[PDB]
Amino acid sequence: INYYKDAASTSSAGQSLSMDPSKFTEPVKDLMLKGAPALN
Amino acid sequence: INYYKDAASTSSAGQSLSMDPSKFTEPVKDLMLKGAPALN
Amino acid sequence: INYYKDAASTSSAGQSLSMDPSKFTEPVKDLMLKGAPALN
Amino acid sequence: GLPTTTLPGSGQFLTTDDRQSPSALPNYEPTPRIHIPGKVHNLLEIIQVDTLIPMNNTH
Amino acid sequence: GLPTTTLPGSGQFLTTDDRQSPSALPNYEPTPRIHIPGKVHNLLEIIQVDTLIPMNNTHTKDEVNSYLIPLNANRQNEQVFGTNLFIGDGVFKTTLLGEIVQYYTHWSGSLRFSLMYTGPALSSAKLILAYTPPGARGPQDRREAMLGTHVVWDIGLQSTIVMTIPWTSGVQFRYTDPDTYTSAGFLSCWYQTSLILPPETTGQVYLLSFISACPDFKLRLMKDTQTISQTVALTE
Amino acid sequence: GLPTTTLPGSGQFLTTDDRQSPSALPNYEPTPRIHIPGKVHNLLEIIQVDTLIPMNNTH
Amino acid sequence: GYSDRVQQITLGNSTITTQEAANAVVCYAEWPEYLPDVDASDVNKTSKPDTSVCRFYTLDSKTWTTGSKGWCWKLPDALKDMGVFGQNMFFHSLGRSGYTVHVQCNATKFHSGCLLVVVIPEHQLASHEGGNVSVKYTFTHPGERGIDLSSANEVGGPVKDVVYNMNGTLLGNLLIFPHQFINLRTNNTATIVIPYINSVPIDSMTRHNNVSLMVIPIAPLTVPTGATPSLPITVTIAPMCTEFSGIRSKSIVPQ
Amino acid sequence: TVASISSGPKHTQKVPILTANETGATMPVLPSDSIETRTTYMHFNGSETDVECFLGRAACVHVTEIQNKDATGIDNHREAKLFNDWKINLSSLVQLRKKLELFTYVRFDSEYTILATASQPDSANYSSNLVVQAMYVPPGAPNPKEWDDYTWQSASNPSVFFKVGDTSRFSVPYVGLASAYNCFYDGYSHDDAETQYGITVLNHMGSMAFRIVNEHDEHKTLVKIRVYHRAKHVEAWIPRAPRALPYTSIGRTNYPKNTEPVIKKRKGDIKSY
Amino acid sequence: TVASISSGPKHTQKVPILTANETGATMPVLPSDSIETRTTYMHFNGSETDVECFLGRAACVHVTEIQNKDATGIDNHREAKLFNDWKINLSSLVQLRKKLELFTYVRFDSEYTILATASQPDSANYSSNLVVQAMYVPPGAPNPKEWDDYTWQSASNPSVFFKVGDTSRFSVPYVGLASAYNCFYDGYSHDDAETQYGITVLNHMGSMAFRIVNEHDEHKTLVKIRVYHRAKHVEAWIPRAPRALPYTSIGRTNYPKNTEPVIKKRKGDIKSY
Amino acid sequence: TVASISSGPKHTQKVPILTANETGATMPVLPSDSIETRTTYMHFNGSETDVECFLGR
Numbered sequence A, B, C: 001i002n003y004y005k006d007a008a009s010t011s012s013a014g015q016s017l018s019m020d021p022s023k024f025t026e027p028v029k030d031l032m033l034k035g036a037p038a039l040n
Numbered sequence D, F: 001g002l003p004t005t006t007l008p009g010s011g012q013f014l015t016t017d018d019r020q021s022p023s024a025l026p027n028y029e030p031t032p033r034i035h036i037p038g039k040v041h042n043l044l045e046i047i048q049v050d051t052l053i054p055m056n057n058t059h
Numbered sequence E: 001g002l003p004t005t006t007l008p009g010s011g012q013f014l015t016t017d018d019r020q021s022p023s024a025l026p027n028y029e030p031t032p033r034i035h036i037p038g039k040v041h042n043l044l045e046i047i048q049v050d051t052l053i054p055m056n057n058t059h060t061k062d063e064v065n066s067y068l069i070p071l072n073a074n075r076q077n078e079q080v081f082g083t084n085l086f087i088g089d090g091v092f093k094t095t096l097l098g099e100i101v102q103y104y105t106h107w108s109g110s111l112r113f114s115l116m117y118t119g120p121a122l123s124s125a126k127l128i129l130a131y132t133p134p135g136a137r138g139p140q141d142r143r144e145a146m147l148g149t150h151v152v153w154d155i156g157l158q159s160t161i162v163m164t165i166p167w168t169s170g171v172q173f174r175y176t177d178p179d180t181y182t183s184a185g186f187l188s189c190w191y192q193t194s195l196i197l198p199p200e201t202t203g204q205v206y207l208l209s210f211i212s213a214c215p216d217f218k219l220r221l222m223k224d225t226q227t228i229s230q231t232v233a234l235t236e
Numbered sequence G: 001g002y003s004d005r006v007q008q009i010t011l012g013n014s015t016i017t018t019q020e021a022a023n024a025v026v027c028y029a030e031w032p033e034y035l036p037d038v039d040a041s042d043v044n045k046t047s048k049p050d051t052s053v054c055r056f057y058t059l060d061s062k063t064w065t066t067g068s069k070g071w072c073w074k075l076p077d078a079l080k081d082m083g084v085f086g087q088n089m090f091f092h093s094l095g096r097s098g099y100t101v102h103v104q105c106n107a108t109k110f111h112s113g114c115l116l117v118v119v120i121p122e123h124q125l126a127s128h129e130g131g132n133v134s135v136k137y138t139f140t141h142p143g144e145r146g147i148d149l150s151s152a153n154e155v156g157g158p159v160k161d162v163v164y165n166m167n168g169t170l171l172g173n174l175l176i177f178p179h180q181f182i183n184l185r186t187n188n189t190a191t192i193v194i195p196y197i198n199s200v201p202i203d204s205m206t207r208h209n210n211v212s213l214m215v216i217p218i219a220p221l222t223v224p225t226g227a228t229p230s231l232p233i234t235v236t237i238a239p240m241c242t243e244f245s246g247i248r249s250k251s252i253v254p255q
Numbered sequence H, I: 001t002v003a004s005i006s007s008g009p010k011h012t013q014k015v016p017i018l019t020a021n022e023t024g025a026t027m028p029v030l031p032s033d034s035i036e037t038r039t040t041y042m043h044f045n046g047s048e049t050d051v052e053c054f055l056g057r058a059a060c061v062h063v064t065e066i067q068n069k070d071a072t073g074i075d076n077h078r079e080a081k082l083f084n085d086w087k088i089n090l091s092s093l094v095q096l097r098k099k100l101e102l103f104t105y106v107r108f109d110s111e112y113t114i115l116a117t118a119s120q121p122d123s124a125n126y127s128s129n130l131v132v133q134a135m136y137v138p139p140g141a142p143n144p145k146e147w148d149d150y151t152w153q154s155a156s157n158p159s160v161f162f163k164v165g166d167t168s169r170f171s172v173p174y175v176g177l178a179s180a181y182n183c184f185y186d187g188y189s190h191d192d193a194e195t196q197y198g199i200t201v202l203n204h205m206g207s208m209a210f211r212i213v214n215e216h217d218e219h220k221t222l223v224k225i226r227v228y229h230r231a232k233h234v235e236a237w238i239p240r241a242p243r244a245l246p247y248t249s250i251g252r253t254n255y256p257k258n259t260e261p262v263i264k265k266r267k268g269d270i271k272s273y
Numbered sequence J: 001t002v003a004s005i006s007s008g009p010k011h012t013q014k015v016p017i018l019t020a021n022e023t024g025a026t027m028p029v030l031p032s033d034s035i036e037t038r039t040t041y042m043h044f045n046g047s048e049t050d051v052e053c054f055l056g057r
């Protein structure tokens, strides 16, 4: 129950439960498959 | 939920969301169209 | 919502909205019509 | 335990507010009402009865 | 009895909170409303009405004359007036727009700047108004001025010209109190050809200038105005 | 008036609790979000990127 | 061939023609109308003299010269003596009215000058003394003469400083009030229709003026060479939808 | 909502930027009438500029002070601040005043907050706990003469009792005589030749009276009352030019003589940036 | 969810453990690519590492102090701590700073808690009860010069009044100019040759001002204000390397000269355990 | 609710304003019995004069 009118006044947000490290761990242009050779 | 009986005791009103500047910006008797000459 | 068991403990009563001055303003035995003569 | 916040005005006594209170005499039974002629409901009922004006105030 | 816990902030008075209160006058009946022309709902409604700018600020005591921008006959290439666009300060500051902007911290939007010409009907003139977006200096000559937002105004039957300073900005809000990062540009005006008076006529002619906000405009985060203060409470 | 009882802990400030508060700036409209590459949601996302170890610590 | 420019207003037994108008303003976009029952309080039937009061009265003329500061008239005061409008005014307890104001000033295509014609609802004046000195009655009831902002401070009178609107606000912002300019080069008249604006449904016509009409030179008058250096300004005003109520003995007012 | 539409080159006979300001209108010209624009959206509603919002936060409207001390031998309680009053008015403080005077007529309910704090400027063993009593003496009501009168009985007068250091709060309906409060009034009470001029004659809604219920301790205690006012359910008509000069009096428009130029003079030319 | 799957002997031409780190990727290698594993489940969600959780607890961001004393003859209230301010910023204290600077841009609403406690370091008969007033002077607002100015009227400025010893709490929407707060900014206000460098030029959101409402008692009272800040509704973009050296200034990245080696030297060889 | 109805000129044999107070009644005479009135509404209920309100603070 929100007792207040504005959105800033609500409690903390709830877990992204998004999670996708590939923008950080695999930003390569041509896709690399694990097990296939790195450099062909 | 109002806890009180009288109307003065309720919280602030809620946004007019009315908004019509023409009584102030265009109080002319004969309607002016933008693009048409001001004085004919 | 009454939180208490006894009737004395409830808040103020609410407007009679009864209003009938005739017991005070016209307690005459034979009915008087405005416009007709007072004493016939 | 439900979380609350108290607002400005807490603890004040406003002679004109209208709320519930505990009854000091739990379960007491008031005397029955009988009929009495003359009940008044509004002060507007009575100011319509005319009364004399001391117009000759000069004494 | 229901169990409760009170949180931090209990008992505080925040002048901006909005809650219910007991009425001191239970059951009182207010006077009926009758109709009155002119109701205002948003300050955004009124900042779109244009008002005069004391552009000619060069006097030494407030005078009707600082509303008049003078024009000289026969000058060529030269500059009529210049100002930066800190709407919360300087020329703008006493105008209705300036005056309202000052109740808020941030503004965004387009401005409408118009000039109404008052010279004899048998005279003629062509002026250029230029808006210079943030990043360059106030233009120093028309050549410099004409490379940015500009309108060649031809003085005619139609007495006023409405220039718009379109919102040119990286950041989507600027501060109303003058700030650098957040600065908006300059506005200048120059003779395009030149003012020419008819025979039997002489002297200076003046332009009146107005400012109002486009429907584009946003103002946010209310605060207190530097435009009013006091040292002791007033009395009757 | 509804009867209440306050529990132990009333009035405490726990830096880790998560509740509602009045907004000091009623009705204010925040700047729109635009898109920015790189959003992080979990610290678990970033500790999977490898970084160099100063293994040769002997200096 | 209708132009914004030519106009005719016929009201009662009087007509005005202008061949050089600049549209007309209707305050707050509302046209004068009578008092509806739903808004009524006084139980008295009102009197609506119609055409005998709703006609055009031309006040005495002013003279714009290079030194003019501006003039100010109050309504209904300015009309307190015009024909039957005025009689009705002194004879009823309450009255209500809207007006058509027509300000006139013609020159030639060699003159320059620009007047602001503005209507200010509830224009409470300031004392030039400062502090909490009041402005006596007579001073705010100049009648058809109006107040001449270039006249001298008098005692018990208002301040007459133009860049402050006679109240602590700047001349430049008067444009938030219904107004129209007379720019010799464009315009030769200004016309404003004023609906009745008050916080009560009907009021006293003598203890309270509900609008001040103000004509202020802003771009100074500049006449052609060797022209006479002045122009007359004339103000003609017509009560419209007038209603009077609570008739009796006939008010006696100071001075 | 679009803030700007897309618009390209123009070579027309239809010129939206030439107008005649003499007419009294402000023609609704936009960036896209005179430059080439791209679409953009508003992302904004104008929520915080609603008049309810503008006049709806608490503002300090009055600071008064009363003291708790032995009234023994005081011939004039009112004069000893054994209790004070404040002939109610919202023109006292100018911060909230300027805001309100942006309009001619205004109608709203009021929410009052009253903060009371105590001071003990000279040697006390302790801080006592005092209870304040704020009673609104409607015009035509017995005015408290003393500090423990019969008036304080306030059997028909709304009154509130709160502790010093604490706050009292409540709300009052719009108690205006007319349909709205007159921010300005160019008239008089009656057709007199000396009668006052302004609203100070229209705004006569009695006064509020404060006092300390507690008797006197051995030391003296100064209690300073601050009244805050918040408009709720606001309705405003007829905008006016903002206040430029300083204020001198509650209820008159008067400004001070030899005031200073309110428009900032340029440091340079008209041509200066 | 499985944390590890079962995997057995391998003799392949498909080697997941040989990669080329020069590419910039971190290939997702698992225990089961190089040893024989058994199934096991995660039993865990990673809840407490969510950025909302990481930045969502209150941190102390500022400690200031003001005193209640007789202002009689004080020529500079600000200077007597008759009232202080804090040109708002979250770079002051480094505990919360390091956490935030793990990201480049950050967007969130703030919840402030303000604790105020009093001290009476020299002989007092008692402890008085003071009421604090925290008002946020938005940039371009009349700055309090005195302790009972007209500014404190704060008729348009959000202000809160709470008691010393008590706490005040509220929340503020994200008041950033841009779409997010810049944790770092490699630019200037304008193309000047002497203009400052950093964010200290970007983060100019006025300051907060505190003061004690109460007049002065016979003794003096020190009130020390602690502001706590909790981010709610967090959004963070572009992770960066954590802060290694100590901080020297609000808003610049500068580290102190002759700082000490931040990597612990081995007590022994590279070969040491 | 109407507070006053509209009423015009009268020339009758039916006079509501002449009464005999000796009877003890207060005859309910209105403005519209003796002047010409216009319609107006009450806009009011008499809420704050209820005896519960009068004795209830």
Ligand SMILES: Cc1cc(CCCOc2c(Cl)cc(C3=NCCO3)cc2Cl)on1
Pocket (backbone or CB within 6 Å): E024, E025, H088, H089, H090, H110, H112, H134, H135, H136, H158, H159, H160, H172, H175, H181, H203, H205, H208
């Ligand atoms: C404008 C304007 C608004 C007001 C307010 C009217 C007076 O309102 C009050 C009432 Cl009706 C009651 C109380 C009150 N009742 C118990 C304590 O205080 C205080 C006020 Cl200010 O006056 N001028």
Ligand SMILES: Cc1cc(CCCOc2c(Cl)cc(C3=NCCO3)cc2Cl)on1
Pocket (backbone or CB within 6 Å): F024, F025, I088, I089, I090, I110, I112, I134, I135, I136, I158, I159, I160, I172, I175, I181, I203, I205, I208
């Ligand atoms: C980063 C970062 C975040 C902030 C916060 C902005 C200022 O926020 C406040 C506002 Cl809008 C109001 C109040 C306030 N209103 C009443 C009391 O305090 C306090 C703060 Cl810190 O500044 N830098």
